[PDB]
Structures are given as C-alpha cells and as structure tokens.
Design an enzyme around this catalytic site. Structure first.
Site, mmCIF file in Angstrom:
data_model
loop_
_atom_site.group_PDB
_atom_site.id
_atom_site.type_symbol
_atom_site.label_atom_id
_atom_site.label_comp_id
_atom_site.label_asym_id
_atom_site.label_seq_id
_atom_site.Cartn_x
_atom_site.Cartn_y
_atom_site.Cartn_z
ATOM 1 C CG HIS A 110 -1.926 -1.136 1.231
ATOM 2 N ND1 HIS A 110 -2.894 -1.347 0.272
ATOM 3 C CD2 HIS A 110 -2.044 -2.147 2.125
ATOM 4 C CE1 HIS A 110 -3.573 -2.444 0.577
ATOM 5 N NE2 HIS A 110 -3.078 -2.949 1.691
ATOM 6 C CG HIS A 115 -6.583 -4.889 6.811
ATOM 7 N ND1 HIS A 115 -7.785 -4.265 7.070
ATOM 8 C CD2 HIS A 115 -6.800 -5.685 5.733
ATOM 9 C CE1 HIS A 115 -8.687 -4.658 6.196
ATOM 10 N NE2 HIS A 115 -8.117 -5.521 5.368
ATOM 11 C CG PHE A 116 -5.972 0.423 2.749
ATOM 12 C CD1 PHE A 116 -7.194 0.445 2.096
ATOM 13 C CD2 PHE A 116 -5.275 1.611 2.939
ATOM 14 C CE1 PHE A 116 -7.740 1.646 1.639
ATOM 15 C CE2 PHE A 116 -5.809 2.828 2.480
ATOM 16 C CZ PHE A 116 -7.045 2.843 1.834
ATOM 17 C CG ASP A 117 -11.439 -1.755 7.219
ATOM 18 O OD1 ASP A 117 -11.345 -3.000 7.150
ATOM 19 O OD2 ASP A 117 -12.508 -1.178 7.517
ATOM 20 C CE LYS A 167 -4.279 -7.063 -2.314
ATOM 21 N NZ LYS A 167 -5.246 -5.924 -2.240
#
Length: 124
Positions: A12, A119-121, A41
């Site tokens: 990210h 984690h990218f939410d 992905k």
C-alpha cells in the site's frame, strides 16, 4: 516470513510519487510490488504519503473496521491515494487494472508494538 507491517508497506505505500500520473500506474505497480504473482488481486489502494504520516493514523480517530474489529483508525486529514481495480479484460497472468487518483481519508487496522498499520480497511 514477511511481517504484516512490512506486507502493508509493500502492498500500500508509494511515498515516491505524489499521485498516479498515467492510466498505467496500477498495471505497473501491481506487478512490481508482486501483488499479481499467484493471482490477480481484485482491488488495491496505494497511498502517496510518507510512511510516518500513515503510521501516525494509528493514534488518530478510532473506528470499527468494516468487519466489526475495533482496532481500526481513520485519518483526521485526507490523503492522496490511487485506487486500482481489475478491468473486464484482466486475465491471469496478464492482470489489468483501472487507475483512479483521489484524495480521501483512509481507515487502517493497527497492531503490535510499535502499534503500526497492518491492513488497509477503506478510504472515505
């Protein structure tokens, strides 16, 4: 094995550019960051800010993650992000993406010590 924190940076972070400059940004980055190695992905978001400013979000607005977890945090300010989404023509191993530049608040999940993003939410 690569740690969750390092995985977050790889998947990210893109501090080297202020924003996506061409429609090919996603195609190039998804490939170069090894996100299309085993499969395409479906979606991914790159953040164009310093790692320190993104790590700082872990001490900002605490909010529930999309999945209900309570270790998520939202940035007080907006950030430059690039959304990558698979195109209708995307087919492994030739994964293809649509590049979308925007300025939004980001929501990340944090853990560990130091307490950093893992984690990218979502972006809002």
């Amino acid at each position: 094995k690569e740690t969750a924190a390092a995985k977050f940076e790889r998947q990210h972070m893109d501090s080297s550019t202020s924003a996506a400059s061409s429609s090919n940004y996603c195609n190039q980055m998804m490939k170069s960051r090894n996100l299309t190695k085993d499969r395409c992905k479906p979606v991914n978001t790159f953040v164009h800010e310093s790692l320190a400013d993104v790590q700082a979000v872990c001490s900002q607005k605490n909010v529930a993650c999309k999945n209900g977890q309570t270790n998520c945090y939202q940035s007080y300010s907006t950030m430059s992000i690039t959304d990558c989404r698979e195109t209708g023509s995307s087919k492994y191993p030739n994964c293809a993406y649509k590049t979308t530049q925007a300025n939004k608040h980001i929501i990340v999940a944090c853990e560990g010590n130091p307490y950093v993003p893992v984690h990218f939410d979502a972006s809002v």
